[PDB]
Every structure is written in C-alpha cells, then in structure tokens.
Design a protein around this ligand. Structure first.
Ligand SMILES: [Mg+2]
Ligand SMILES: [Mg+2]
Ligand SMILES: [Mg+2]
Ligand SMILES: [Mg+2]
Ligand SMILES: [Mg+2]
Ligand SMILES: [Mg+2]
Ligand SMILES: [Mg+2]
Ligand SMILES: [Mg+2]
Ligand SMILES: [Mg+2]
Ligand SMILES: [Mg+2]
Ligand SMILES: [Mg+2]
Ligand SMILES: [Mg+2]
Ligand SMILES: [Mg+2]
Ligand SMILES: [Mg+2]
Ligand SMILES: [Mg+2]
Ligand SMILES: [Zn+2]
Ligand SMILES: [Zn+2]
Lengths: 100, 114, 222, 716
RNA sequence: ACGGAAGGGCACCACCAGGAGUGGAGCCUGCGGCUUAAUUUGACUCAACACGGGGAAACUCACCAGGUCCAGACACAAUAA
RNA sequence: UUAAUUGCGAUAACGAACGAGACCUUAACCUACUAAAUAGUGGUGCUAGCAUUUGCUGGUUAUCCACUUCUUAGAGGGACUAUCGGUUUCAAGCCGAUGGAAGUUUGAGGCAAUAACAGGUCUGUGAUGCCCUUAGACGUUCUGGGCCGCACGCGCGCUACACUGACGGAGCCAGCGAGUCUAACCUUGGCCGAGAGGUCUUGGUAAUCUUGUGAAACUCCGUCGUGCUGGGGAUAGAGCAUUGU
C-alpha cells in the first residue's frame, strides 16, 4: 500500500509531537513501519534596507523563515490508514497523505 | 471492464449495484465496482445476472414491508417527535399566515353579530 | 498544486490579510488577535475579542456575515471556512485591548496625563510585571513631543523580550493631527506556562533540610 | 445533526436593562469514538429465501420462507465467513432466527461441536431452550444441555452437548477451569445476547469473559468467533473495537425503524412528594390513559417497587368500579369455566384481582402463580399486566401500551432514591407493540418535572454503554491469572489491556473519575494506580506476597479458581480456623460469608429475629461476642438463626423468611465446600470430620443429636 | 559645553609595523553646472552622491507637446415621456 | 581589575531598576541515542574490460541482505579558562605550560537603556492636520519625447598597464540558493547552426530533476619574448539572432 505522510510545519516542537504519536501508533498496531525522515531545514531569507526612505547609513536587515519537513512511510491495509488522517491535526502543522 | 480487482467491500465503502445488490447463491453483496468489472460472484463464482400469481406470493409481500422499512427510514425525521401535553403545536405550515391577523377578524365580526 | 516553499509563505499572508480585516471591522468589539488552524476538509478560524456577544450577535448574525465575507474574497467553498468567537483571558494583560482603551479616552476629550495613568494602573492591577505606554504628537501645542508613562520594570534586550513583552501600536486621529500610541506589557514569568517560567538570569536554590548527627552507630533490622 | 459553530450560554438579569453576560464555548474534542455509526436502510430489495441455502435438512425446517428484511447487511455474510460481527437488533426483530446463524456459520464445516450461547438472565435461559427442543434437536439430531446453577448435568452429556445456554456468572465458574477442564477445547464461536448491560451489576461478569477468549486466541494462534446481539447502542465504534470485529460487517440500526412503530408521551407530576404520596396523584391519570390509548387492547404498567405492584392494583380496580363493567374485558363468557381458573388461584391479591381483567406478577408468589398471569394474557383474557421492571428480560409479552408508573426506584447502596439508568426503561419499551397483531403501539413515561426535560432530550438518542467493572474489579482480577500466567507487574498491565475499560477510560476519563489529565499518558498512571490498588487491597487479606516486582500465588490464593471465591471473605475468617472445630463454632462461620450480605433485612424484622434468638439452640448474644459481636439487624445474625430453624424444623413466623431460607440454603452447600478444601490443605483431620456432619444435617434438616432413621418418610 | 589644561583608560569608521588600494588612463554610474519645451524630484561633512531597494525604450512617471473621461457620492431646485 | 559602574573592595548611605552580561541564531566536537532507496557504505545476484591465480575499475532499480563512518536532522552531552607553575591588599583577576574538537567574553551576528537631532521621510501606505486644485481639474487614461541630453568639476566603482604574463590544448575541485496551475518556470537529452541561438521531447511543486551546478582563479604540456609587443580593449563600420506590440 506504501502510505506516505509529509509534515511541513514551521514550528518544530508540535511537529515533533505529531510525528511522535504516529510512529508509536503503527508499532502498537503491529504494523511494518518505516522511521521518520527529517529533510534538511529550509531557510527562507529576505534581506532589505531598514529605512523607508533613501537616507542614512546603509544598514541592512535579514529576516528568516524556517520550514521543517518530515515524512513517515506506512504499509498496511486501507481500513487502518483511513483511521489515521482524521486525527493528529494541531494548529499550524500542514499534513497530507498520499496513496501508493 | 475486465478488471481483476475483486471489490469485496459489500457496500461498506462503495454504493451497491442497483441491478445486482447481492449474490442469489451465497448472499455476497455486490457493489457498483464489483458489478461493473465482473458479472460473476466473488465468493461462489455464480452468475449475478442471467444472459402476481406466477410470482411467489409472500416474496412479493416481503418487499412490500421492506420498501416500507426503507420508507420508514427515509421518513424517520418526524418519527422522533414527542406528543407531550405542554406543546402548543401551532400547526402553521411555515409562517403564522404571513404574519398577519385578519382571519380572526371574522370571529370579531361574528362576536359583533352575537 | 503549490510548492511548500510558496504554500507556507502564502499561508502567512492569508493570516496577515485576515488579521488586518478584523482589526478594521471589530475595532469597537475589542478585537485582540486571530488564530488560523487548518484541518483537512474543515478550516476553522478563532476570533479573540473582549465582547463575545457583539462578535457573535443574535443567532450568530455578525459571525455569519463575517464568515460569509471571508467566503467571497478568498473563494472558499461553503462549509469549508467556519469562524469562532472566544473571549480573551486576562484582558488586562493584552496590549492590543489596552491600546484601544488609551485611544478611546483621548477621543472623548479626556486629559492625556490622567488617561495615560489610568491605562497603566489597570494593567498593573491585572498582574502584569511591567507596563509602558508612549504617547507622541502635538500635545497641547503645535510643537510635537513625546510623553512616556510606565510602571514596574520592562526589559529591553535579548530573547526574553519576545517571550514576555507584548507590543501594540494604534494610531489616533484628532482634529490637530495624529497622535501615536505604543503599549508594551510585561507579564509575570511565573504564569507563562509555555516555555520559560523565569528570566534566564534568575537562580533559585532549594533549601536543604537540616539533620542532627546520630552520634551513635545503630541498626534498624527488619 | 449539523454541528453549530459553538455553544452559547447567556445569562440575563430579570429587572435591569442590559445586564447581560455571554459565553461562547467551543468543542473541538470530537474524536472517532464520539460518533454514531448507524447504517442507512439501503436498496437490497431481493433476498435469499430459504431455497438459497444449499442444505435440504435446514430448508425442510423453518417454514418461514420470506427472509428477514431487517437483516439487510447480514443475510449470508456470517454464513460463510469466519469474521467477528456485531449485530444491533431493536425489539424482537429476529432475535431467534439470527441466533441460529451459529449453526449456519461453521457447523457445516465441522459438525459435532459445543458452541455456547450466553444470556444475561436465567429467565432467558429457559425460553432459549424450551422453544428449541422441538425445533433443532428432532431434525438436526443434536442434543442441547442446560448449564446453570440449579442444573448439574453429567460431564459426558456436556461434552456431547451441541449448544450450551449459560448466564455469564455460571460460565465464570466453569471458565475458572480453562487450564485443566478438557471440556473447553471446542470453542470456535461464542454467541451472547443483550450485551449492553455493562452499566449493570452483571455486565462486568460478562465483560471479563470476552477478554478471556482474546488471550486464548492470541496465545493458541487460532481465531475464536464471536457475535454481539443487542439493541441500538450509541457508542458502536468502541464496542466494535473491543468485540474484535473487522470492517466487513457492523449492524447498528436506530430505534426509528421497527416492525411496529412506537409512540411515546411525556407527562409531569408535582415536585412536592418524595416517593410515597406520588402514587395517589399518579394512579388516577393511569386509568384514563388505559381507556384512551388501549380501549380494547392489552396494556402494561411497570411499578417501581414490589409493594407498588399491589397499591396500583388496589386503586386501579377501585377506580374501575365507577364505569360500565367493573369486571371489564375479563374475556370469560362461560361462568362455569370462570370458576375453573379461579380454583387454581392460591391467595392474596391474585384471588380478588384476576376477575377484573388485571394480572399481577412479582417475585412473591408460587412458581406456578407467576405463569398463570401469562397464559391468560397469552390468549388475551386479562388486559393489565402490572409487574416489576425485572420482567423486561423474561417471556416476550405481546402488549401494546407500556406505562412507566413513576420513576426513581430505590437503591440500597445510597440509602436513597436514585434516577433509573437509561438501559432498562429503553428496553422496557420493546414490550410495547405486537408484531402482526396491531399497527402501532404507544408508550408513556410519566416522571417528575426536573427529570421531564431529561427524558424528552435523550430517550430516543440514548447514552453510551459504560463499564462498571471497577466496583468488583478486585474479585475478578485473579479469575484468569491465579493459574500462574503472569508473575510480574510489568505484564500485569498487559492482562487488562484488551478489556472494555480502556475503550472508554481514555475516551471518557470524566465518567471513570479521572480529573487530572485526559490524555492517554495522563490516564496511564491513573489506570496503573487502580492496578496498584487492586494488588495492595489483596495484601491485607494475606493472599498474595510481594517480592518487589514479583507476585506469589500463595496457598491462600491457591483456592481462587475451580470454585467461586470472594477474596474478602478469606481474611475475615482466616484467624478463626483450628483443628478441633466444634459444631457450634462452624455454624457461626457459615453465616459469616460475605455472599450472604445480599440477604435483605426488612423493617421490623428485628422484633421477630430477637424472639427466635432464645428459641434457637445457640443464641446470637451467646455466639457473637467481643470482636465478633454483630448488630441484630445484620443479615449474618438473621442467617445464623435461619439455619438453626431449618435444623430444628421450626416454623418461620412469616412466609418471607421462607424465601430467604431457600436462598440461604441454596448457597449453603457451596459456601461449606470452601472450608473443606481449606481444612484439607492444613491437614486438620478433626475439622474435616466435623464438616461432614454439617451438610448431612442441613440436607435433611435435622440436628446432629436427632436420629437419622426418623428422617425417613412417615416418621416424625 | 568648551580649553593649543592635568590625570587614567580605550578605537585600524585613530596612529605605529605593513598589506592592498583610491587620487593618474578608458569606460559604467550618481551629484553640481550648462543646455532645453521638459531635461521631474529628495538628500549638501562624518551622518549624500551603484543612496531613495532609483539596473527608467512604452508602464513605472511625479516633467514636456497634445487628445479623451469623470468614476462630482448624496441632498435641494430647474428641464422633462 | 574587566570588553563592560565588570567585580574585589572602601564607604552618609541602604535597598533596587534599565543598560552590559545572561538570552537567541549560526559555525565547528561526538565511530554516543532514534533513524533515513528523497543520502550513502560493504557484501550477495546479472554483466563490461585486463590479468587471468585470489584482483582492479566499473554498470545495473522494483536483484536483495546488514550498517549509519561520511550526509541530513530531532533528542543529549561537551568548556566552567579544567590541571599545574608564577604575580597580586597575596581579592577580583592576569601571564605561561599541559590536556582539549574547541581556552583573544571560542568566532560572528540578533536584540540592544535615558536624553536628544527642530537629521531623513508628506514620492510606501485609504497614516495625517492645514493650505492649493477640484471638470479645456495638479484626478485618471491614450500617443510621442525626457529623466541618458555635454564646454566642464567631484564620489562609489570595473578593465588593466605584462613573462608572479598572454594565448592554445588538456587536469579538474566548491558552497549559499532557486525553479510552472489555470501557469506557462528551472531546464538535462537527441538534432541543426561558427557563434549567438532554433526544433522535438524529458524530469521536477523539488535531499530525489536541472545539479557532482564538472565555477573561476588555478595545475601540467606547448607558442610568444621585452618590442604600446600575441599588454590594453574604449573609440568606429558591416553582418547574424534573441527579449519585447
Ligand atoms: Mg585593537
Ligand atoms: Mg600606516
Ligand atoms: Mg585597481
Ligand atoms: Mg559615526
Ligand atoms: Mg534600462
Ligand atoms: Mg517613461
Ligand atoms: Mg506616459
Ligand atoms: Mg552489479
Ligand atoms: Mg593558580
Ligand atoms: Mg557577544
Ligand atoms: Mg515614510
Ligand atoms: Mg537620474
Ligand atoms: Mg556608498
Ligand atoms: Mg554541491
Ligand atoms: Mg588582448
Ligand atoms: Zn465496492
Ligand atoms: Zn455467491
């Protein structure tokens, strides 16, 4: 069946929480389970002048947004993967599931 | 369609085949996917579709109440009502006669007649 | 089909667009921030305000049209977006609500000195460790100047500023120009309950329990 | 049905203007257990009538050819498959034909098996057998043997038996012997009915049985089939996740669809009478309701207590006088035949009430008097069948109207009146409505105003079935574990893992008393604390010795299976046993059993209890002394005096004591058997000799000084 | 506050010991000036001059030679099928 | 004495607050934990070349088996100037040696107090008071110019003025990033064309495809030879395409 779930939230502490109950849900159900894979962190950077006008010393500001993404692979019949998606939803943690 | 995917859902996750709801030999429920990809039973490999006095009488009677059972389920929204002895039961269809009081002015006219 | 690099950025702008819409509509309903939580097939938005009845209204009239307003602009299908209404806990400890209170007093002709002390006094009485309100503009004269009002103590540098200080800025429109209002409130670290419970430079030592010498070798057999 | 965005609680003043305070409450605690599964009635128009069964022997019987329409999903799903399924059947909509799917399930694959049926009450047991003695055995050639506390068949008959019907309590005793009783090896399918009684007292007994087969199936590595027979249950998913059923098959139909439609009415009665005066206020409105709703059709009224079975009859017959026919609807045209049935009537209310068309039934009559009220109603001679709530489990009475006469039956545990649980009155409506006799049926639920809104809101919806094992959880922990399956507490957590409690404890922590944390981790220490409580409450009974993480099956815990043991009884009499036990000493010990505490002591019995205390051979005041001194009201004192009366053949002052004596004598043999095994292990030969003299005296009702020859018939 | 007043301590937007450079040449680019109808404009030491995120063919565009449109809500009076 | 009103202390002051520091992000250390065909490693299968005698270089996605040293992380640890020797009312501290991945607060940053400037900004804003315009309107829109205009003076800059070079062949190594939905982005591959570029497809919403970004400076073998010269590449003319009306 090869169920794959990807999680791409910005805040990591809940993202580690969501990946914590999922991994133990499979083993407690005696499911062949593939460990979570933590992809390299994506650092989205924007650099801009601080001043609104054109006056002053050329001071530059850097802003960063971090994207933490993991995936976990599951292999099991549909009747248990369908009872995973509707739960483990917490604020600001994007979750999607792909079949096959 | 010739698909070999034997969908044995029995209508759990798919709509049932209207023409062939079940197996007439071993009772397996055949859904639309199961009916479309094969006309044979999944379990006992029996044909699903062949290529009132005469009809069995109580067989026709069985579906009469069965349709009522479906009718009861379809019309079960209002069967949950409680009669009570404190409900006004305004009996108005959707409004109090357009929110307008002149039908009882005749009763006032009747009272003027009295 | 949008990449996750652009999806999260487009999600933050959705939060940014949705945030400024409420502060311009519920300005007299005490809007105090919004939160967006995404669930498959069901998107929910939590409005936080001081007056939960006005945000809801009779039969949820206001929240329905506000939910319906979001539907039209963002092209969300009916039944996908649902708005909530929730009161704000510890209204004295929210800078945004107290920023509105400062603006409210000025527009009614109240004195700048007395009104400013009123905002900081309520915040201090509500359990805040520190509070600071800054008023800038043409005060009693054409020549503009700033007047800072504060109580307790507020940190200014380091990471804990983000953790403990909430900042609110609200422009005020008056007949003589524009008066700026800035409110910073520092809550007690002892009630944070999310992350740090104290300043990084606070060290607390558990008092040891004294015990007199036994003065005699003895055994308690079992 | 469409969930609102929030729930709003508005409080407004009554005199001032604008004194309003509103709260908006969100509910995001919506998990899959918090749902109603249900199944829409789909288009399955064509059935498989009889002929589509491929067995001439079965098709030659059951002349019902039209196949059960309310089996829409079921039909032949379990006929061939070996997968567990849950079936919710409201009312008597196939309770008999579906229960016979066990033979259709796998008996053809392997014949000559001993599939066991389970019923929650012995009243069902009699009818689950008698109806099938002329239905299955004469045609299938398979015999069925009853297994109850009153029947002790030969083990060879039980081994060769094909079907076994047993209450969960009686199945527990034989299931205590799973290790050595070679009889239980042929279990392939287990079927039980009326399974939503876990909230009741007997539910925990049945609940722990299911977890037993789960461990049997798990270790032995072969599946054991199950089948759940019940009515509409709100929390179907949790039961589905505990019964071990799979996706293919789940039967949850609501009470909306029934063979006979049900009409229900609500009425309120004033809140200034506690229990007693609110029978005169309610008896009269019952009379008008019977005539209005059941003019010429049978009615049925459910009184609260045993005495109210009489009081309602007294007033209703009195109110029946003020109309045309005082003996209305007697349905006895022949006066000569009228006196025929009245001849068999014994005494008391039945003598002067059966002539009015009203029948009475309660557990205070002759065993044939209870039946007499039924056969007359079987051919519709009597109309009113005023009875107790305990009759909603026995014979299926085809009545039309069910009346809830009052509410809030008394509970002895709280010395007060408590609201009736929403498990019995819901089933009590099932008697209303006669299949193929009348179109629709009516029901009325008369209640106090404070509870009037509660039943309007939730009577149709129903409530989740809850597990009440953690009131007797200390007793049945050693039911399956005293064999020596687990030695350490680490796996003791595993022993309770697949019980029904975890299916509701984590889902509904509030009901079970959890108030600290609702998370699965938060409940983990709470459930372990209960496990820690269970082992420590067994320590003061000095039955188990702890070696840290290890538990020890001591000789005191050695007798916990093969025989019912209440554990708490062991410690009470542990410091009393001695080799030279006298006859007087043991008579005190027999009445000290905890199981005898259930004997009721009616008001004013102390006066008559004291009278026979001196009349008894061993007075209570001279027997229960110092630490063993007991109050005269205590049932142990009453039980001690009852045994002496039986030995001395002393006539009891009232007939009520006779029923108690029969109950006391019923458990006398099994309770006395406990001391035989205990004394045998200790080698107290003198005590053992004393034991044999007791049941001989008890069986023949004669003292040890009496001549055994006089016991023979015709001899005083 | 200032001192071509004293005392103590610091800094490669200071110096020493040096490095590599700019200033010299061509070219890109900004500023001033001159020109023009317009060559739109801000910033005059550090703290402006590859700065206005200003690398402008049209847009941007704010300047010039010209041409359209009214997006003047609403209320009042007038003309008026 | 410290980078520090940083500390030891003295003491008509005691007790505090802000700032510094702590904090946060990043860089390095772990053959320690959980791992990971979207990263690899060794071996087993099929297979190419040479020696053939045990090998070396390799190729292989539905060929598997085991692992996380290298690569990514999440949770942790690790440094506090540790030990020692000197100097100091012998206090804070400082110097030196050893050990250490790391010992100039470890390096580098974010944040960063009070009081001010009539510093810049009305041309970022539907943020603005007041003033001006408000219908051949300073509004908007369309066409074409200009902001590039050139006697001249300055700043930020890039190319060099040569053999530590230039040119021609080969050698061949990074890291930070980015990439298409109602769009047409990053483009590998085949073919055509000096070249620029053009055509047909392909993979990629992306650790998996561009991409080992096979980058340049640089390394080696050859030509030139102290010559405004094969240094230098503006100034000008002709032709071939692309961006875009
Ligand atoms: Mg220096
Ligand atoms: Mg120098
Ligand atoms: Mg140079
Ligand atoms: Mg400076
Ligand atoms: Mg250009
Ligand atoms: Mg232009
Ligand atoms: Mg233009
Ligand atoms: Mg190979
Ligand atoms: Mg030293
Ligand atoms: Mg630092
Ligand atoms: Mg500005
Ligand atoms: Mg310019
Ligand atoms: Mg510059
Ligand atoms: Mg690289
Ligand atoms: Mg050249
Ligand atoms: Zn299907
Ligand atoms: Zn079939």
């Amino acid at each position: 069946i090869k169920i794959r779930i990807t999680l791409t939230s910005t805040k990591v502490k809940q993202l580690e929480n969501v990946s914590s109950n999922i991994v133990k849900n499979a083993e407690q159900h005696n499911l062949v389970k593939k460990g979570p894979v933590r992809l390299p962190t994506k650092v989205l950077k924007i650099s801009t002048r601080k001043t609104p006008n054109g006056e002053g010393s050329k001071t530059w500001e850097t802003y960063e947004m971090r994207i933490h993404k993991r995936y976990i692979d599951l292999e099991a019949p549909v009747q248990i993967v369908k009872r995973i998606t509707q739960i483990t939803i917490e604020p600001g943690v994007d979750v999607e599931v792909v079949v096959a | 369609s010739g698909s070999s995917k034997n969908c044995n859902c029995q209508g759990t996750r798919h709509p049932v085949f209207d023409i062939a709801p079940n197996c007439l030999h071993c009772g397996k429920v055949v859904c639309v996917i199961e009916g479309l990809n094969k006309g044979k039973c999944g379990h006992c490999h029996e044909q699903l579709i062949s290529d009132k006095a005469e009809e069995n009488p109580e067989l026709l009677a069985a579906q009469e109440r069965l349709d009522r059972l479906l009718y009861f389920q379809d019309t079960s929204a209002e069967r949950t009502k409680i009669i009570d002895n404190a409900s006004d039961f305004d009996m108005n269809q959707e409004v109090g006669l357009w929110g307008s009081a002149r039908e009882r002015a005749l009763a006032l006219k009747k009272q003027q007649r009295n | 089909l949008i990449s996750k690099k652009r999806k999260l950025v487009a999600d933050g702008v959705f939060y940014a667009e949705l945030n400024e819409f409420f502060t311009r509509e519920l300005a007299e309903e005490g809007y105090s921030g919004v939160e967006v939580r995404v669930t498959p097939t069901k998107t929910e938005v939590i409005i936080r305000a001081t007056r939960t009845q006005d945000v809801l209204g009779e039969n949820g009239r206001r929240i329905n049209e506000l939910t319906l307003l979001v539907q039209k602009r963002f092209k969300y299908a009916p039944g996908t977006i649902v708005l909530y209404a929730e009161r704000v806990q510890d209204r004295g400890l929210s800078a945004v609500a107290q920023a509105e209170s400062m603006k409210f007093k000025l527009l009614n002709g109240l004195a700048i000195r007395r009104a400013a002390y009123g905002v900081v006094r309520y915040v201090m009485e509500s359990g805040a460790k520190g509070c600071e309100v800054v008023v800038s503009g043409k005060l009693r004269a054409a020549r503009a100047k700033a007047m800072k009002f504060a109580d307790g103590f507020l940190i200014h540098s380091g990471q804990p500023v983000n953790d403990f200080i909430d900042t609110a800025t609200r422009h005020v429109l008056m007949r003589q120009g524009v008066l700026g209002i800035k409110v910073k409130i520092m809550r007690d670290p002892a009630k944070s309950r999310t992350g740090p419970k104290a300043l990084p430079d606070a060290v607390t030592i558990i008092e040891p329990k004294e015990e007199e010498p036994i003065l005699a070798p003895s055994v308690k057999d079992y | 049905d469409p969930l609102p965005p929030q729930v709003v609680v508005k409080v407004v003043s009554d005199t001032w203007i604008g004194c309003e305070s509103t709260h908006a409450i969100s509910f995001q605690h919506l998990i899959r257990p918090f749902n109603e599964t249900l199944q829409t009635k789909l288009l399955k128009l064509r059935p498989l009538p009889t002929s589509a069964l491929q067995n001439p022997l079965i098709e030659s019987i059951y002349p019902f050819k039209y196949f059960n329409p309310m089996q829409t999903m079921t039909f032949y799903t379990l006929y061939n498959t070996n997968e567990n399924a849950f079936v919710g059947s409201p009312t008597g909509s196939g309770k008999t034909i579906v229960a016979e799917l066990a033979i259709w399930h796998a008996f053809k694959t392997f014949p000559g098996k001993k599939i066991v049926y389970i019923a929650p009450m012995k009243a069902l047991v009699r009818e689950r057998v008698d109806d099938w003695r002329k239905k299955i055995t004469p045609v299938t050639g398979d015999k069925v043997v009853e297994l109850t506390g009153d029947s002790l068949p030969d083990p060879k008959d039980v081994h060769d038996a094909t079907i076994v019907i047993t209450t969960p309590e009686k199945f527990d005793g034989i299931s205590r012997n799973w290790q050595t009783r070679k009889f239980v090896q042929d279990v392939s399918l287990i079927i039980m009915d009326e399974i939503h009684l876990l909230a009741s007292d007997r539910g925990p007994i049945l609940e722990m049985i299911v977890s037993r087969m789960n461990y049997i199936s798990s270790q032995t590595k072969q599946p054991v089939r199950l089948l759940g027979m019940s009515t509409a249950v709100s929390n179907a998913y949790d039961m589905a996740g505990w019964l071990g059923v799979k996706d293919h098959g789940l039967y949850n139909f609501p009470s909306s669809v029934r063979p006979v439609p049900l009409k229900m009415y609500i009425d309120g009665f004033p809140d200034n009478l506690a229990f007693c005066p609110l029978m005169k206020t309610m008896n009269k409105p019952v009379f008008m309701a019977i005539k209005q709703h059941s003019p010429d059709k049978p009615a049925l009224i459910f009184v609260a207590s045993r005495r109210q079975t009489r009081l309602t009859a007294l007033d209703l017959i009195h109110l029946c006088g003020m109309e045309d026919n005082p003996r209305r609807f007697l349905n006895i045209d022949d006066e000569e035949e009228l006196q025929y049935y009245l001849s068999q009537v014994t005494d008391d209310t039945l003598k002067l009430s059966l002539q009015f068309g009203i029948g009475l039934h309660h557990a205070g009559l002759v065993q044939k008097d209870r039946s007499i009220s039924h056969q007359l109603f079987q051919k519709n001679k009597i109309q009113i069948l005023i009875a107790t709530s305990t009759l909603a489990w026995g014979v299926n009475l085809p009545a039309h109207l069910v009346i809830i006469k009052g509410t809030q039956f008394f509970d002895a545990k709280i010395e007060g009146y408590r609201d009736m649980d929403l498990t019995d009155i819901l089933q009590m409506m099932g008697r209303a409505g006669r299949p193929a006799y009348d179109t629709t049926g009516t029901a009325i639920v008369y209640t106090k105003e404070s509870k009037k809104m509660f039943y309007k809101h939730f009577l149709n919806v129903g409530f989740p079935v809850e597990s009440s094992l953690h009131k007797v959880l200390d007793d049945h922990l050693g039911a399956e574990i005293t064999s020596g399956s687990i030695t350490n507490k680490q796996e003791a957590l595993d022993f309770l893992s697949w019980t029904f409690l975890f299916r509701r404890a984590h889902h509904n922590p509030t009901y079970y008393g959890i108030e600290d944390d609702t998370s699965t981790a938060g409940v983990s220490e709470h459930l372990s604390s209960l496990i820690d409580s269970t082992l420590e409450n067994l320590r003061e009974s000095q039955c188990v010795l702890l070696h840290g993480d290890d538990i020890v099956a001591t000789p005191f815990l050695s007798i916990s299976s093969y025989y019912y043991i209440s554990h708490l009884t062991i410690r009470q009499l542990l410091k009393q046993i001695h080799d030279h036990a006298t006859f007087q000493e043991v008579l005190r010990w027999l009445s000290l059993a905890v199981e005898y505490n259930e004997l009721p002591v009616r008001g004013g019995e102390i006066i008559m209890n004291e009278e026979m205390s001196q009349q008894s051979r061993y007075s209570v005041e001279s027997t229960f002394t110092d630490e063993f001194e007991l109050p005269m009201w205590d049932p142990h004192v009453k039980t001690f005096l009852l045994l002496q009366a039986h030995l001395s053949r002393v006539d009891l002052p009232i007939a009520d004591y006779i029923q108690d004596t029969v109950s006391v004598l019923d458990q006398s043999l099994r309770i006395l058997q406990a001391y035989i095994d205990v004394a045998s292990e200790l080698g107290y030969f003198h005590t053992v000799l004393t034991m044999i003299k007791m049941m001989q005296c008890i069986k023949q009702g004669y003292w040890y000084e009496d001549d055994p020859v006089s016991v023979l018939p015709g001899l005083q």
